[PDB]
Write a protein that binds this DNA or RNA. Structure first.
Length: 225
RNA sequence: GUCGUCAGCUCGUGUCGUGAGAUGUUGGGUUAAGUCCCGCAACGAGCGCAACCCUUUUCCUUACUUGCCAGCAUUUCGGAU
């Protein structure tokens, strides 16, 4: 299920952000800059991506669960399609604070979200008239948008997979606090300090995002034990 | 009594701070209103607001006197009978 490299170049993972917005810790991976935009080598990217896929396969073989983190506008739909494909919990919309460090509270929300969904499936909503029915149809849609991923989860995820570390800095902080490993995509303007498995790649390109997400989904599906 | 029927006052768990403490309650609209909706390391609660109580406006059921008189009859023309 390896990506080789040619997929990365054709997608466009080599492009980064502008030079003036770079993080100096990336000096090892940047390797140069053709123009006012940094261009990162894929030679260092490839082994890190392959090792990330290997660790994901190990997790799937051990039946451990990998949470998917993307809240950016562009990457949300792709991480949705691939997360449904891999059958893994996901966070597509805004990251609500402390779901991991404050595990106890949010399952109140989860159980009454499940109860609302089951009531909607049943005839309870049918008895009730249109106004307030529309009221918690809206209300349940609001719970569903924030918690579309984690009804099925019964415990802390064993590993995280994050698209933009700089954008989802809070999630990495919580994961670091809890000790759970994180596989994340780090860009030119990103901080790799607390990422256990650091693989560098583009975050703006929807093609690159799709390739990354599809690779992880294929790894989980190819676990098969 | 008064500010004044002014709209605020708080807690649990998480995060930040050596600490007293802070966040939630913040920003954009809207509303009688911390009323509601988006944004947001916050997620949810309680008392306040609103509703539950009384009265007025439309209709229905039950009740027909000491109250009522559409139809019938008698009238001293007064539901007087």
């Amino acid at each position: 299920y390896n990506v080789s490299m040619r997929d990365l170049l054709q997608a466009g993972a080599h492009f980064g952000h502008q030079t003036r917005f770079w993080n100096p810790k990336m000096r090892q991976y940047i390797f140069g800059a053709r123009n006012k935009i940094h261009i990162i080598n894929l030679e260092h990217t490839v082994p890190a991506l392959n090792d990330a896929l290997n660790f994901a396969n190990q997790l799937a073989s051990k039946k451990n669960k990998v949470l998917f983190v993307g809240t950016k506008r562009a990457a949300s739909n792709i991480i949705r399609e691939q997360a449904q494909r891999a059958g893994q919990p996901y966070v597509d919309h805004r990251w609500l604070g402390g779901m991991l460090t404050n595990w106890k509270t949010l399952r109140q929300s989860i159980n009454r979200l499940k109860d609302l969904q089951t009531q909607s499936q049943d005839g309870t909503f049918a008895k009730l008239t249109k106004r307030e029915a529309l009221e918690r149809t809206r209300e349940m849609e609001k719970l569903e948008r924030s918690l579309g991923g984690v009804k099925n989860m019964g415990g802390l995820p064993d590993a995280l997979f994050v698209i933009d570390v700089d954008h989802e800095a809070i999630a990495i902080k919580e994961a670091k606090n809890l000790g759970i490993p994180v596989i994340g995509i780090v860009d030119t303007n990103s901080n790799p300090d607390n990422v256990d498995y650091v693989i560098p790649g583009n975050d703006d390109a929807i093609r690159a995002v799709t390739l990354y997400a599809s690779a992880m989904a294929d790894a989980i599906l190819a676990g098969k034990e």
